[PDB]
Design a protein around this ligand. Structure first.
Ligand SMILES: [Ca+2]
Ligand SMILES: [Ca+2]
Length: 384
């Protein structure tokens, strides 16, 4: 297993300056950081003390190293790899609503105030002039200028979009527009042996035990739709019917049954109020047990971490996000070392990793890692 430090004879540290020195080909070169020293030595050496006196006997050389590299490369105890991206919108009713972004690589604290979006819940979002609807699935294009459509899909006029960050926009998969699947032959007489009333695109119902079951009339059969979709269909075009005509179950039992893929949920749509729930998250995890990654959209009152973690947030100067980390990470998207201040440094190959004493990198999503400030590549070629 070989855990712990490397003990060599080529790396030294002064008593007063705490400056590092690396012994290269008999000549003592100085080095910016412990990270760079290990790059050139080819081993994760731990420095040995030495009073300035002994440094004098040996001659000095040109300084080597990577000034922008992290000092060392510590990693926390994981194991687990949970990566979460969060948008928090400040003053959502304002003029002037504003979004801030958090990157989180630590266990989450999920509760009723901040938890996954439920199936019937959705967030209206604005990005570069266009509006989108965010659900458990991802983001769907939606035209909020079109009140006829919005009213038909159950989106109230009180509903307002809030800005989503570029990072969160890119992290959310595109699920296609928020619309009812087209029925181009709609309004045309049916060919199923149904009454002439029930034209293609019309909605009927069968009265069962556990409440009515709605059906849309399609060219090649009848398709089951939920109440939401039935209401949606009829709101855009009812084809002259005050209500969906009732069907005796014996009349449709030999009609072909088809699927109508409405994105509308069973329960009535609930558009979340951003001033009430300003946080919108995309959370990703993939336990080392091989598998496939698992991602989920969260919505809530604040970040899904303990209140004590809130004081640990580091906002990078060269960056967009506040980063919440419980120690350094070694990840594979192509490998990166990520320091506790949330800077990513490229690790080009496995021998460079071995030199640094980094091993067993965790899988992590590029969608989140790329948002971290990009530091210099950790390479011996540049360490020299
Ligand atoms: Ca809370
Ligand atoms: Ca909730």
């Amino acid at each position: 297993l070989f855990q712990g430090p490397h003990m060599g004879t080529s790396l030294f540290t002064d008593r007063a300056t705490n400056q590092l020195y690396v012994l290269l080909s008999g000549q003592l070169h100085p080095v910016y950081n412990l990270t760079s020293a290990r790059l050139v030595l080819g081993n994760p050496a731990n420095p040995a003390t030495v009073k300035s006196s002994e440094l004098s006997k040996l001659p000095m050389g040109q300084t080597v190293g990577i000034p922008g590299a992290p000092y060392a490369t510590p990693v926390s105890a994981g194991s687990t790899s949970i990566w979460t991206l969060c948008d928090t919108v400040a003053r959502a009713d304002s003029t002037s609503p504003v979004v801030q972004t958090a990157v989180i690589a630590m266990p989450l604290e999920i509760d009723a105030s901040i938890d996954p979006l439920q199936s019937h819940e959705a967030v209206l979002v604005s990005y570069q002039g266009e509006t989108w609807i965010v659900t458990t699935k991802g983001r769907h294009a939606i035209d909020l200028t079109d009140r006829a459509l919005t009213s038909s899909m159950g989106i109230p006029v009180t509903a307002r979009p809030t800005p989503i960050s570029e990072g969160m926009f890119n992290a959310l998969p595109d699920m296609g527009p928020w619309q009812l699947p087209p029925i181009p032959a709609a309004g045309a007489p049916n060919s199923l042996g149904l009454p002439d009333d029930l034209v293609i695109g019309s909605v009927f119902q069968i009265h069962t035990d556990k409440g009515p079951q709605y059906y849309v009339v399609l060219p090649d059969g009848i398709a089951q739709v939920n109440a939401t979709t039935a209401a949606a269909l009829r709101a855009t075009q009812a084809h002259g019917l005050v209500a969906p005509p009732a069907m005796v179950p014996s009349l449709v039992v030999r009609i072909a049954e088809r699927v109508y893929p409405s994105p509308l949920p069973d329960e009535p749509l609930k558009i979340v109020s951003r001033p009430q729930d300003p946080a919108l998250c995309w959370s990703w995890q993939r336990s080392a047990g091989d598998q496939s990654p698992q991602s989920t959209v969260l919505s809530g009152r604040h970040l899904p971490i303990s209140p004590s973690a809130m004081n640990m947030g580091i906002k990078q100067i060269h960056g967009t996000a506040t980063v919440y980390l419980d120690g350094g990470k070694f990840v594979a998207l192509s490998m990166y070392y990520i320091d506790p201040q949330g800077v990513r440094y490229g690790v080009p190959n496995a021998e460079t990793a071995k030199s640094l004493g980094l091993s067993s990198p965790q899988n992590a999503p590029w969608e989140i890692v790329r948002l971290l400030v990009d530091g210099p590549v950790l390479s011996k070629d540049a360490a020299l």
